[model samples]
Target chain A: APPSIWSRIVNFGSGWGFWVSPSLFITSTHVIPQSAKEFFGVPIKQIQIHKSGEFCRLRFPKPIRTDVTGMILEEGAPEGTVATLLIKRPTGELMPLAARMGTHATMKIQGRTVGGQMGMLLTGSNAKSMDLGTTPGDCGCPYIYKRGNDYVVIGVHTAAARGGNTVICATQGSEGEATLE
Target chain B: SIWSRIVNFGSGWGFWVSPSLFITSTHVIPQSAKEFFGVPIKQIQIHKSGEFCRLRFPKPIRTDVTGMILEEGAPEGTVATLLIKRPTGELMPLAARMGTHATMKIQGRTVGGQMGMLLTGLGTTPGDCGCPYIYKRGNDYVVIGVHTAAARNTVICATQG
Candidate 1:
């Protein structure tokens, strides 16, 4: 059987990482950026996030690239909270599922440093929330939440900054759509 | 596989030879030396007569012989009837056509001491054709005879000399 998301971390080349979800891992990188790189990194290499957010770099064997035009986000979502997640089907169709954010959520983005824009940052519930951490070479991971019996993704890791604050961005908003392009 | 094939061929021949002789006895008439010589003897019928009896084929000339003995109380035409029925009327072996009758007669001698006779047409009658006849020769229960007829109505085995 394929390794579980938790077991995948143990099998990672940079082993000693903690599993935030089946597909989300946080070491010294932002959860959102790592998730983004993991999910979509081929077409878009570097992801740009809020200037205040931090970014982390994750290397992948192949650049994860996919189209995300029809991806939808849940409406009437609160600030500093994620209510939807982006999903890419095997048929290359992008979808979004409404998700309820738990105390901690994660996200990922993808892009390249085309101009002067640095990498992306994914922030958690609070700016002082040190619960999220990033290690070197952490990027393109997905932040997931448990909805009913399923784990719905909410965000992707983008970057990390001073005071150990990890930056993550929602893969479901106007900014989230821009990250895909 | 070749060795197994040869062993199976030999084993099949052995199995068929024994049973084939046993069947032939019930279908052929058991002729005596005197009868073979065309002697007009007073042919008396055996006491018990039916389709169940044991017969033997002697070695040298392979003559067919029966164990049913002639008795006064038997039906008059029993012997002739049985002989006719042996090969002419029945599809079974000669010994089987002898029906159910048990008696003793001296079988001719062969190269080995006295020729041994195999039992046939047995297991036809209850308490009549079930046990192998044994003779107390010194301390041993020598199997001198066998009920080689049918059981009740079924013809079973045949004998060989």
Candidate 2:
């Protein structure tokens, strides 16, 4: 409907990403390197990296600011519960992708198995899902859920699993608990 | 990760998607499964001591499949389940990381296309490759990928949809 939702969805060269804070954005480590000169088609120039490559943190270009409410990562519902992933399609569409919270073992693409991190395990029949599932182009899009009217991000779309059956979701590892050292 | 229900497969992981349907990676699927009552293995089960888990399928259901393997985003993926009695039913959310085509180069050996979709470290044991990689979307139980193999930095990649 409105193009506002699409504004939060940032498309990278190889994957997708979204902002947690207006200035700091999050994507898969695999999607970005230690530090990149450019990101999501924009010249990010000077960049900073946090701990693991699973969750990469970066800042926006100078003079660019966003009023969009960034997402916060948290654990999802039990397997077989309600959940959602928001994405701005490459074709100029704001997708409120409807999905369910599933279960998991190790994380992938955007998945990992670090015991204490408490990331997320997600699954969805993209074809059977409301909208289309995910694509390589949609990798880093934030996996979100609603909390009282505000949409909070629980994880990031990392990979496709089960042949469209599900996408690997790596939760924002510690939600800023891990700092730059 | 949910360690109780997890039955390792060396390099990957597998869980019961259904009583009989077990999901894992294409590279990890065994050449054959043990015969069931008699023929090409119609039904099967896994348990620690006695009979913790079992699957009663129609013999012809031990199907092996492959989807978007190491490919960029081919879509079509699969996973596994079963022999998991200790269903603590705890909500564990996993994290997914992104990689590039050069992800294979990080391993020295080569497989699949150059595009990468790697993640994790829960699979380093034998029989761990077929482990199920699932996550929550809402109330629906979504199966994403099957735990496949080991990689640099304890990362165990998978086959996606």
Candidate 3:
């Protein structure tokens, strides 16, 4: 009757790379380097994993408030633009779209030593593998990425995993269903 | 037949007399009557004039022959004689006679038809003075004497004169 329900689900490519699944992404700002090195083999010299629960929401180190007047060019907002808007809202506020949202998908990432260079000393119980990308429609999933050579984590990509190792970068303004004109 | 009748009459009447004679009378003997007669004074027998005298000893003895007497009509100040054995093993005479000189006189007043008097030298000491005097007083033989003068080591009884 309706377009196959599977068409609505987000899909990803097949490859080994850090993928983004949460709606909020930062450029490796909040991840603790020591923890990343220990847990995911990312050599981060400094990082901070925001406390879980309420504080988990990304709070820009400083608040930003601006008022701007723009023309209401509402010609039925673009397709991905709507999705980006939806992703901007926290997962708790997305109940209306529950039936459409697909289940979370799992993936993995491996630690690499570029050019055989020694990285920062990391200490933690590595799981050998982790469920990389969370279920679909989950906003604010955190993805840790390390810089080459130094092994210092340099990115925390937040966005849905498009399968493989690529993530829809939320910081690139592609969050939720929103699309750029 | 007469003698048997007399014996039967005696048994039937229960006519019995104590071997220790007892006397209760006014001025029977003011004090220490037994000591005066060279007999040990078991108790001082005293009481009112008409009451009977009652005195008892361990066993019966002839009343008249037991070295005790109640001298009648003796004058005041008449001394009583006491025979005592001395350390030299000779019998010495200790005169414990009647009369005010030898024995202390105790003036007794009559109460309840009885005379309250005192006895001295009846017992050797104050503690021993309360030895009961069992003798006849008037018609009955009963305890007619009790030691009442502890200060003087004396016994008192109800008696006249």
Judged by lDDT, which candidate is best?
2
User: How well is each residue in A20-137 modelled by candidate 3, as lDDT tens digits?
Assistant: 2122112221222232342122122322333221112222222221121111111111222211111111222211110011222222222311110001101001101112222343
TM-score of chain B of each: 0.19, 0.42, 0.26
Q: For candidate 3, give the lDDT of residue B83.
A: 18
Best first by TM-score, ranked: 2, 1, 3
Per residue, candidate 2 scores C-alpha lDDT tens digits across A59-110 of 6554244576655656444455445566556665444444565664353322
- TM-score-superior candidate, 1 or 2: 2
Better of 2 and 3 by TM-score: 2
Q: What is the per-residue lDDT of model 1 for residues A65-114, given as tens digits with 9 covering 90 to 100?
A: 22111112121123444332222222322222222332223333345321
Q: Interface RMSD (C-alpha) of each candidate?
A: 48.2, 11.9, 70.2
Candidate 3 lDDT over B112-158, as tens digits, reads 12222222121223222212222222333233222222234222322
Lowest lDDT sum, 10 consecutive residues, model 3 chain A, at: A116-125
Off by over 4 Å in 2: A1-3, A33-35, A39-46, A51-53, A59-63, A75-81, A108-131, A162-164, A174-181, B1-161
How far off is residue B146 in model 1, in Å?
Answer: 96
Per residue, candidate 2 scores C-alpha lDDT tens digits across B44-159 of: 44321110122334543423332211222222222222111112221122233323322233235433321222222211344444544443344344554444444432333443
- lDDT of candidate 2 at residue A34, scale 0 to 100: 41
The numbered model that scores best in TM-score is 2
- Segments of candidate 1 deviating more than 4 angstroms: A1-3, A7-132, A164-166, A176-181, B1-161
lDDT of 2 at B90: 18
Error of 3 at A73 (Å): 99
